[PDB]
RNA sequence: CUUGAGUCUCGUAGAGGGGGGUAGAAUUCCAGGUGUAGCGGUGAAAUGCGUAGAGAUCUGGAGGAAUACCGGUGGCGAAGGCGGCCCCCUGGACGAAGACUGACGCUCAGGUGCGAAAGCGUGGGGAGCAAACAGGAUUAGAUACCCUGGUAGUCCACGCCGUAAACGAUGUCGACUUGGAGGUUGUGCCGGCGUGGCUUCCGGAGCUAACGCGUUAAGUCGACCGCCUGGGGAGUACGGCCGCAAGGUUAAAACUCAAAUGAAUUGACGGGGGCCCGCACAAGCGGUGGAGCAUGUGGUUUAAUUCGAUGCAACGCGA
RNA sequence: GCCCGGAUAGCUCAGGGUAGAGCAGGGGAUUGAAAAUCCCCGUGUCCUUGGUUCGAUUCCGAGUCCGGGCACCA
RNA sequence: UGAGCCUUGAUGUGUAGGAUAGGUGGGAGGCUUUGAAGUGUGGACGCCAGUCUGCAUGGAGCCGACCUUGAAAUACCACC
């Protein structure tokens, strides 16, 4: 805000994996404060992804995540009434947050049966570069590189 | 603003020397000053205004 | 088509566009490129990025002549005065001389009236 | 009679004026070589130019206008004004020592002369710029601001015109009255010491409604001239004089209002400047506006649909 | 009547081993707006038919239509 | 500087595949110290994968039918 005094809120870790990343993934997935439901959904999705990929739950998740992280975004800046689209770098924490938000949003728009099935299919598609999340990442990248002249 | 590069110096130092030579030559100032016609009354007005503001 | 091995680059930079031409010492053009001809239309046409893109494209277009030495004369006050020469050097030429050759009247004719914006 | 006023001897500085010549940079046009798909313009565009070869680049030629740097609240002139270099003609100012005339002085109604720019007549000239005009935009409209073109004019010779916020909004001449910091230009004595002319800034007494002026007075006095008498009507009508014309100069009356005005003070406002704060923006999450129902209100209906709140700060409000 | 060239997307259109470039229109990043950008999307016997060829939008014949120069014009 | 006209030398990897092999063809012998496999090196062309090309060193081998193709190997040769 106007003060630059805010702090960082600590987060409880994953029970059976001990990864803060999956806890934040559950938090992003969680709606209405029902955290047990989100934990069950994410655990089922990770289990089916691990069995259908064979590596494990963890590095398969990270590999799927890395295909969605962006490295440059676009910010509007007003100069003379007309707004320039300046390309700016993205902090790694913002990269993780954007990737998980995109993955969950893409999962919610699918015609599959259960939420875990949608999440598993989307996560595998991202892991092998065919989901809509990678499409959104490519859209952002192309829009950012199009306005490369405004990058002072 | 004629810069003849000497022996083995890098490109950056020659470019900086050329920029400095163009800065001390008042090239862009003259170019911007001759873009539009400014009346003699405005010339005297702003010259005197600069003089009094300095003092 | 011919080997000259040493030419001069003319950069014509204004507030709206930059034009780069390559010629031999006698003053016969070999190739040219422009910021507006490189897919930059409008405000984007008047930026240093477009100027250095045009510089790279013009350097590419004159490949068949085997240029190894190059002088530079730059005229005009435009934003693309320094990006172009940097891009031209990075393309592999040797900038052996830099000159500003912008015209300046020694009085001259009456400039247009001022814009009331 | 010599102190006011003027003449003579030597010198200094200066965009002071009239005439003629010449130089360099740049814009425009003309012819030619290289070379190829854009150029130009804007907040964004479009009109406009270009494959009949533009824009870019190089060579040669024609023509007109103005003189970058020096350049400076620097200089010259009564004012208006005056800026490359060179020659011819010419006006004034100041300085040092001496000589000469002997009140020859100051101001000035009527009169006469000069007087930016625009404008008018005749004859040339025309690169750049640019009223009028045409087209493209923006806009609710745009007879404008912005863009592309573009004719009188701007330039020269002669002749009219006689007006400007022609302003220091401060008539000319003379004498007297504490200081400080500079600029420019002469001169005497030994970098120091003095002494004249013009000029910029601050400030004391004094003056002023205040702002402010302050030895270059808006301080204290003397001589002469011009001008003012509430605001509109009106610097207008009629008459005279001047002009080719546009118009200039002198200059009222009826009627109407109780004010019009100057300087400064306290706030408020600014599509003025500086510094800050708030789920005020920016980052996120969940909603309302669509559907069904509950409830309040407006409106319409009724014998009555009781009364009040009814921009934010009334409408699941008094209840 | 003859000769000369053409038939390709919704439009304009180049092209013996393929169907191609731009804009039109639709949605969304997108902002109050045209901008302006990004993203895709289709948009096809390459006029019809027949004929060679390992298959022809391509080469060949006959037809439908457009344009040009001619000829008949008693 | 245009148009036709001969002669030469190149030029032509849909997909097979050692092979940047067009229609056609008498037809597996030419080539070879008339210095030849393979070379350093000059150079051309190029859907840049590969075709063409002088000299030098070097010294005398490549080689036709062979399996994939619609076809063989510019082994000479001729028709476009
Ligand atoms: Mg202009
Ligand atoms: Mg003089
Ligand atoms: Mg003079
Ligand atoms: Mg030319
Ligand atoms: Mg003076
Ligand atoms: Mg004199
Ligand atoms: Mg004189
Ligand atoms: Mg006497
Ligand atoms: Mg007098
Ligand atoms: Mg008089
Ligand atoms: Mg005049
Ligand atoms: Mg006139
Ligand atoms: Mg005239
Ligand atoms: Mg005339
Ligand atoms: Mg013009
Ligand atoms: Mg108009
Ligand atoms: Mg007057
Ligand atoms: Mg004046
Ligand atoms: Mg006055
Ligand atoms: Mg006095
Ligand atoms: Mg004072
Ligand atoms: Mg007074
Ligand atoms: Mg006085
Ligand atoms: Mg006085
Ligand atoms: Mg009058
Ligand atoms: Mg009269
Ligand atoms: Mg007042
Ligand atoms: Mg204020
Ligand atoms: Mg304020
Ligand atoms: Mg917000
Ligand atoms: Mg509702
Ligand atoms: Mg009520
Ligand atoms: Mg009541
Ligand atoms: Mg009421
Ligand atoms: Mg309530």
Domain boundaries, chain B: 1-55
Chains A and B make contact, 3+ CB pairs within 8 Å? no
**Burial letters A1-28, b for 16+ CB under 10 A, else e:** eeeeeeeeeeeeebeebeeebbbbbbeb
Identify the H or E element spanning C100: strand C95-100
The span from the CA of C44 to the CA of C48, in Å, is: 9
Chain A residues touching C49 at Cβ < 8 A: 148-149, 151
Separation in Å, CA A114 to CA A82, A107, A135, C89:
46, 11, 23, 60
Which chain B residues have any C-beta within 8 angstroms of a chain C C-beta? 1-5, 11, 14-15, 18-19, 22, 25, 27-28, 30-32, 34-38
Q: Which of A22, A12, A8, A29 is nearest to A118 (CA)?
A: A29
Structural method: cryo-EM
Which tokens is C113 given? Answer: 């009236």
Which tokens is A103 given? Answer: 């993955």
Q: Which of A56, A140, A57, A63 is nearest to A94 (CA)?
A: A140
Please give the nucleotide, over all strands, whose C1' is closest to the CA of residue B34. Answer: D68
Model resolution, angstroms = 3.0
- Is the distance from CB of C82 to CB of B15 less than 8 angstroms? yes
Q: Which CB contacts under 8 angstroms, 24+ apart, belong to C63-67? A: C64/C1, C65/C1, C65/C2, C65/C3, C65/C4, C65/C7, C65/C30, C66/C3, C66/C4, C66/C5, C67/C4, C67/C5, C67/C6, C67/C7, C67/C22, C67/C93
- Is the distance from CB of C86 to CB of B16 less than 8 angstroms? no
């Amino acid at each position: 805000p106007r003060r630059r005094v805010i702090g960082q809120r600590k987060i409880l870790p994953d029970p059976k994996f001990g990864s803060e990343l999956l806890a934040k993934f559950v938090n992003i997935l969680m709606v209405d404060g029902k955290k047990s439901t989100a934990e069950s959904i994410v655990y089922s999705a990770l289990e089916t992804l691990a069995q259908r990929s064979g590596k494990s739950e963890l590095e398969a998740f990270e590999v799927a995540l890395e295909n969605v992280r962006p490295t440059v975004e676009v910010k509007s800046r007003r100069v003379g009434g007309s707004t320039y689209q300046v390309p700016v770098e993205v902090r790694p924490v913002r990269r993780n947050a954007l990737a998980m938000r995109w993955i969950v949003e893409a999962a919610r728009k699918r015609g599959d049966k259960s939420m875990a099935l949608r999440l598993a299919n989307e996560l595998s598609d991202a892991a092998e570069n065919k989901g809509t999340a990678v499409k959104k990442r490519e859209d952002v990248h192309r829009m950012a590189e199009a306005n490369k002249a405004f990058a002072h | 603003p004629v810069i003849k590069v000497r022996e083995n110096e890098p490109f950056d130092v020659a470019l900086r020397r050329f920029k400095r030579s163009c800065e001390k030559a008042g090239v862009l100032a003259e170019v911007r000053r001759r873009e539009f016609y400014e009346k003699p009354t405005t010339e005297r007005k702003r010259a005197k205004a600069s003089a009094v503001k300095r003092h | 088509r011919k080997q000259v091995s040493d030419g001069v680059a003319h950069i014509h930079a204004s507030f709206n566009n930059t034009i780069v031409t390559i010629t031999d010492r006698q003053g016969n053009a070999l190739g040219w490129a422009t910021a507006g001809g490189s897919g930059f239309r409008g405000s984007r046409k008047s930026t240093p990025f477009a100027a250095q893109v045009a510089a790279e494209r013009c350097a590419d277009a004159v490949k068949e002549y085997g240029i190894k030495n190059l002088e530079v004369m730059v005229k005009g006050p435009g934003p693309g005065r320094e990006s172009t020469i940097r891009a031209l050097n990075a393309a592999g030429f040797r900038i052996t001389n830099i000159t500003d050759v912008t015209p300046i009247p020694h009085x001259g004719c009456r400039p247009p009236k001022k814009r009331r914006v």
